[PDB]
Amino acid sequence: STNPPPPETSNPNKPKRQTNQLQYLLRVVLKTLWKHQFAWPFQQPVDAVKLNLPDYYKIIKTPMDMGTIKKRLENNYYWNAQECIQDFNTMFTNCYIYNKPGDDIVLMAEALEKLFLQKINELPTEE
Amino acid sequence: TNQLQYLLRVVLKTLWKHQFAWPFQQPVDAVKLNLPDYYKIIKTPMDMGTIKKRLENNYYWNAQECIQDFNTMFTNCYIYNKPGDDIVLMAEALEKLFLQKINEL
Amino acid sequence: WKTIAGKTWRTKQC
Ligand SMILES: [N]
Numbered sequence: 001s002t003n004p005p006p007p008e009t010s011n012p013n014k015p016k017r018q019t020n021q022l023q024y025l026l027r028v029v030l031k032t033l034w035k036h037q038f039a040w041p042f043q044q045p046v047d048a049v050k051l052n053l054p055d056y057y058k059i060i061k062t063p064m065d066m067g068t069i070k071k072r073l074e075n076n077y078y079w080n081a082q083e084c085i086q087d088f089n090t091m092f093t094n095c096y097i098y099n100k101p102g103d104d105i106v107l108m109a110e111a112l113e114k115l116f117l118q119k120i121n122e123l124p125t126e127e
Numbered sequence: 128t129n130q131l132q133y134l135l136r137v138v139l140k141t142l143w144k145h146q147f148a149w150p151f152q153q154p155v156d157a158v159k160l161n162l163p164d165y166y167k168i169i170k171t172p173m174d175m176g177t178i179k180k181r182l183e184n185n186y187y188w189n190a191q192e193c194i195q196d197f198n199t200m201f202t203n204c205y206i207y208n209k210p211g212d213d214i215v216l217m218a219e220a221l222e223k224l225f226l227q228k229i230n231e232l
Numbered sequence: 233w234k235t236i237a238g239k240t241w242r243t244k245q246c
Binding site for chain 1: 233
């Protein structure tokens with residue numbers, strides 16, 4: 001009936017860092033996925049209330065969306081690119097585990113992930 | 128002793144509480160789940176229920192044997208289900224949390 | 233609707 005609090009976007013205990021890879025994950029990778037036509041259901045955290053999905057947060061316990069990833073990158077939340085990529089994987093994985101293969105939301109997530117993999121292939125060398 | 132009790136009260140209890148743990152907490156009931164070809168393919172079944180019963184009943188000789196049963200459970204899921212399947216992704220989340228706990232043995 | 237290991241829930245599609 002209610003949505004849980006969103007994932008954190010900053011943490012004083014977590015060491016902050018800004019690298020050219022993390023800059024590329026914000027300026028190139030995330031910007032490309034964000035501007036995509038299939039991006040609108042992945043921009044904010046999954047609103048189980050408006051979608052009439054009482055079971056979504058009974059199944060998914062580690063939610064993730066691109067808005068959370070966007071704030072974390074802007075707040076230098078990640079120490080390296082792997083941690084940021086791991087949130088992307090969590091966002092896609094959650095969608096594949098909760099929904100059926102062939103659903104609209106899964107076809108949409110599969111298209112975003114393919115473009116995501118296209119940019120990750122050319123992630124710059126850490127300088 | 129210290130390594131076998133750590134796998135029972137820390138490793139097994141952490142994975143048991145995980146969100147994606149319910150398919151792996153008990154042996155696969157292929158008759159109930161309507162999987163007639165499961166035990167034709169999986170010749171070494173393993174689950175968290177039996178691993179729990181082996182730790183609290185002194186069945187392992189060292190921590191390495193307990194890691195084998197965990198890998199056997201993960202393998203039997205990666206063998207029977209297609210890569211990228213929902214159930215496979217759930218098993219990869221458990222294994223990642225498993226390799227993070229074993230790394231701090 | 234989706235079923236995994238006995239547990240069933242509503243997907244976004246329904
Ligand atoms: N739905």
